[PDB]
Point group: C4
Chain length 345, copies 4
């Protein structure tokens, strides 16, 4: 009762667990440095999403000072985007990124001369002709690293690299605010997607960015273990003070807004078919604390895997599949939490 | 320990995700024409269900104008069913369909004389002696395309085609209001159902109608991608103004009544054993808006699969299986939804 | 896992596949065998449980072509009186339950004219059960149903020692906790399939006991090899059921407990069933009708005019949790009750 | 093939399996529950209370040893208060008792041994590490006492610890009620598979496996042992009891007493640190003896169904099936509303 078009089972983060290794490294000893693109390096593998409710200059500066990096979003006029990147990199000469859309060549040139360090050429569907052509023209008119996405296949990864991609960004449907997989029925579970694209990208030494889906620090580890060089994360940071967003109080708890870029209110700035929704998140206050627990989680992970660098994590990692009942085991069960903890909201 | 009567794992829409392909086509540019039966074609692949709470002249004209078609139900006397066909057909010469049950041979005859374009010969169990007979009985006395259902096996569909079926409706159990799989314990998960029937029907150039189970626009893309020529929808249109039945209000919001044809009220028109229940659905106002975003979801899908027609969708589509945790990924997770979206409610 | 011997499936796990059919549900024959010598008109048995089956319930099943097993949780003559009342009423067929080593109880029941005796146990595949089985068969002319088991080997051995019927089911009952307290059991479909592979070779009927929630489960159970099903909770809420009706909301309930529960045992005892509560569903007859209606519907879709033909022609697919939600009513809110689906 | 080359297979946990009944001549009351705690120390029952500051101190340890099991005093205190605590147990009839220590705590260990502790539990969130192996070697060279080392979940960890003098191996990473390791670090192995793998190595060497964490119900005991463990370690069940340290609180009309991970913020204080446990509460379940009685009742019942008169016969004759979520629904109570609460089944 099985069909010719079934190409296998796809796995998400909650589907797997990482297997502990013989270890002689402490979590405090772990190197977290990583390549963002082929030519840009980072000291922590974290990237804040290119979203209007997540990353502007204040988020980027915060990211860059902690060793990561932020991608200013393109939902604004061209050189107000330039002002954002001028702010960050006048500020301690920190390293920063910016996003552009299909054929937005003028926007990109400006950002480059504003000193932006990486351009993220993003799209609902990176493995597309308009994307490929937009990438070729950039690399011919501009000397700057370009991350391209989003994609989820071998074929996409390979072809984008063959045309100049300095980084490949993975993820269709995994985001907290994404409805693509429901509206269009399209996607690939984030672990399998990162796996497929790693097996090609690593051949060329091109970094993969695992975009979307990250819910707990343990997910950061899984993503990297499987072949990512960094993760892009939206909803975790959208709770912080540094995200742009309007705070609201509905009951006894305070929230601020987090919406998809393919959401109706995002596209207005109708007869539209949206693939993102508009939502809120619990306000988690200060950035530096959220990021620290994320980094804490990853160090703990790599220690369990006896891996002192991302690169050693790739060599030594393995995982087991788990069931729904395995996941139940993995979470807290049968006891009732008396104090909120930042790790585990 | 496994058993010899187990013939495999049957999959439904939530069990899979369609995988992106290289695309040179934008959702805008996609063609959606399809074949309803081998001699009748539609310009969108959508059919409204033959239900007393879904389709009548008003729904049918609305469907036809949009480029689809409506099947007027048979929960009425013969002459009034004919009246319904005349209403749709005098209104712009639009295509329209009518359902008949087994042995209902003069009903069919009248309907055809009334200029109906297709007859839908329906039964809970399409693959039975009486349906075959009724089918051969219509083709001999009438010149009209006949759709036959419902079935879910490939031998069921081969045998209906051999006796003159112009289309086959697939679906046992998947309906929103269907209890056949619980009362009788019988059915096949809709994807596996469509796959098996496609593998026979397509070699004869006979269209598969995937009937029942559609919950979101991405479901439509899945159904067509694995072989369907079109889809039949009840509950999504049941809550439109153009639906028959009247609104009633329980709380803040108003609901419009949707029931099975196998429900007791439906068969009332009580020593009965029902395979359908009686329920309510959100009133979602005008159908045009409802349908508008179904079509947009499909286009979005076909865009992701680089397919500019259903033909190419058939050639190029592949899918992965996902776990229930992969499904938790695909939906919105960890964010509270601030405002309504008709795509996703 | 070395010890992993495969995946076991329950009723919710599968769907039956439709066959070419030329038989209407109304035309289907539901005759079957209880034991190799006792046959029924409908393949239903009410559970030998003190909240389910006494004389008023047993006479109820036989009425509709089935049978009920009077429970052993009473003294001998009172059980004997229960079987006398059913026999004296229309001469209808009835059964009664006894425990291990309770041979005396047994022929009192036999002398009272019981049609079938159910030798039951938490664990039918045990030395003591085989002992009692063997004395009974030597001192009494009676069909004996033995349980509960879930393996090929248990089925084979019980039959080799004289068993006239075999009850299958360890842990599926609505009120059972065995799989939680002991960690033991086998999912009901796989269990029936295992036991039918042996039992049908010998022409010994299997009773699928417990776990039945909807009429679709009856068809599944028979389709994979059972000759009948035993039913507790569906019937515990009926009128002809013993036990008592408490009102708590604006809806009516009556109690239903496991025979391995604290109240059913009366305390340093180790409970393996619980004390519970079930919606009152009025008169039995309507419940049975809807169950038979469901099964006739099932066999219609499979083009099977009898159980023997249902055995020959049935296949199933496995479904996910997601398939299961497709299968139930989804995304529509139900206006008022239906008997089938509640 | 959407199959990843780093995928080494499916891991299973207690709720994923069911034990299959065997022919039986033995009754639950006839079954032997003796087992080996460590290579040289043995118990009347396979139960061990957890080394947690909300579960085991002398009163719990005494209570355990009474019933034929053993308690492990937690290390979340100074050195000779832990010593005094094992003194309390030993002067209560020479009962068996154990004590936990951490990496490089050789001094504490020495003081524990001098006080007559029967076993030292060398614990760590990651038993398969350089500093644990070293600590094991140093203890074994300067002292004579059985050392249990954990926690691990792999064959090679199991092998490497035995090769360096481990007398018992404790299995479990992420399974516990108050544990968030698998969410914070994304690391662990489902408990059944974990015990299996570690059993396949340890049994050859005659080294007992202690199954640590994840026990929700008595039938989980039988499963851990049937798959190869010689004992199970239990926290949350006993945390609710009377002899548990931690003082009661009432929030509902129901009493609770607190239960926290040793890797919880509060426990570690005993803000700039990263939690792999949480701080919670459990229903007060009254006196210990009833709770332990029910768990033993359950196991005896398991072993009866499996026709196994001892743990070694259980290891030989056990088998299981994988079940699905729907199988688990079948297994729990269903379609019935519970009128009287049951200690078996909370
Ligand atoms: C690039 O062409 C395509 C576009 C779509 N759909 C969209 O672009 C919808 N959309 N329209 C605008 C946006 C957006 O800003 O951000 C998104 C992020 C993720 C997913 C979608 C969007 C988005 C579907 C298929 C194809 Cl082939
Ligand atoms: C075709 O004969 C059969 C009928 C049934 N049951 C029914 O059709 C009951 N029923 N009785 C009336 C109806 C109905 O109007 O619409 C249905 C839609 C789906 C499923 C059932 C019905 C329905 C079962 C098996 C067989 Cl073989
Ligand atoms: C004595 O044989 C055994 C008995 C048990 N347990 C019991 O019989 C407890 N019990 N004690 C009385 C009963 C009972 O009436 O019905 C039951 C149904 C299922 C499970 C248990 C019972 C039950 C478990 C294993 C074995 Cl090997
Ligand atoms: C140095 O060993 C490691 C320690 C950790 N983490 C911790 O020790 C955190 N922690 N820090 C203190 C504790 C603790 O007392 O009990 C625990 C129980 C289980 C899990 C963690 C703890 C715990 C992670 C990876 C490695 Cl390799
Ligand atoms: O509107 C949307 N629809 C679908 N995906 C989106 C949308 N907006 C952002 N995304 C993706 O979701 C990611 C954030 O995922 P999150 O960290 O799980 O919330 C972004 O980096 C984008 O790749
Ligand atoms: O009462 C019934 N029982 C089972 N299926 C039904 C019944 N009435 C209609 N159907 C089927 O369900 C389809 C609509 O399902 P929906 O789109 O999921 O709500 C119809 O087109 C019929 O094929
Ligand atoms: O207390 C008990 N513990 C476990 N199983 C029981 C107990 N009492 C009765 N059973 C079984 O459960 C069956 C009924 O289950 P039900 O039809 O699903 O509610 C009975 O026929 C017995 O086989
Ligand atoms: O804070 C912690 N994080 C992770 N595991 C812990 C922590 N504290 C105790 N444990 C483990 O959890 C076990 C008890 O879990 P339980 O029996 O399921 O409640 C203990 O025996 C330890 O192995």
């Amino acid at each position: 009762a099985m069909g010719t078009k079934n190409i296998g089972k796809g796995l998400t983060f909650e589907d797997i667990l990482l297997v502990p290794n013989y270890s002689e490294v402490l979590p405090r000893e772990v190197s977290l440095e990583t390549k963002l693109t082929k030519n840009v390096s980072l000291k922590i593998p974290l990237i804040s999403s290119a979203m209007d409710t997540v990353t502007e200059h204040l988020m980027a500066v915060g990211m860059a000072r902690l060793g990561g990096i932020g991608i200013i979003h393109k939902n604004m006029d061209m050189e107000s985007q330039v002002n954002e990147v001028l702010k960050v990199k006048n500020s301690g000469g920190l390293r920063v990124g910016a996003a552009i859309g299909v054929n937005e060549i003028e926007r990109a040139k400006l950002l480059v001369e504003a000193g932006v360090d990486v351009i993220v050429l993003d799209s609902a569907h990176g493995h597309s002709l308009n994307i490929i052509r937009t990438l070729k023209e950039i690399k011919s008119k501009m000397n700057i690293d370009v991350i391209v996405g989003n994609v989820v296949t071998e074929e996409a990864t390979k072809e984008l690299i063959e045309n100049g991609a300095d980084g490949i960004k993975v993820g269709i449907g995994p985001g907290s605010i994404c409805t693509t997989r429901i509206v269009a029925g399209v996607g690939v579970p984030q672990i399998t997607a990162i796996e497929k694209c790693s097996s090609v990208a690593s051949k060329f030494g091109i970094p993969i960015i695992a975009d979307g889906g990250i819910r707990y620090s343990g997910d950061i580890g899984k993503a990297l273990a499987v072949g990512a060089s960094s993760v892009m994360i939206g909803s975790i940071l959208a709770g912080t003070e540094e995200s742009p967003g309007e705070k609201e109080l509905i009951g006894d708890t305070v929230y601020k807004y987090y919406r998809g870029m393919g959401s109706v209110g995002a596209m207005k700035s109708n007869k539209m078919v949206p693939e993102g929704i508009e939502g809120r998140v619990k306000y988690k206050g200060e950035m530096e604390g959220v990021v620290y627990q994320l980094v804490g989680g990853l160090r703990s992970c790599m220690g369990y895997l006896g891996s002192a660098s991302i690169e050693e994590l790739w060599k030594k990692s393995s995982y087991v599949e788990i069931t729904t009942s395995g996941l139940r085991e993995s979470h807290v069960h049968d006891v009732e939490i008396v104090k909120e903890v930042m790790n585990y909201s």
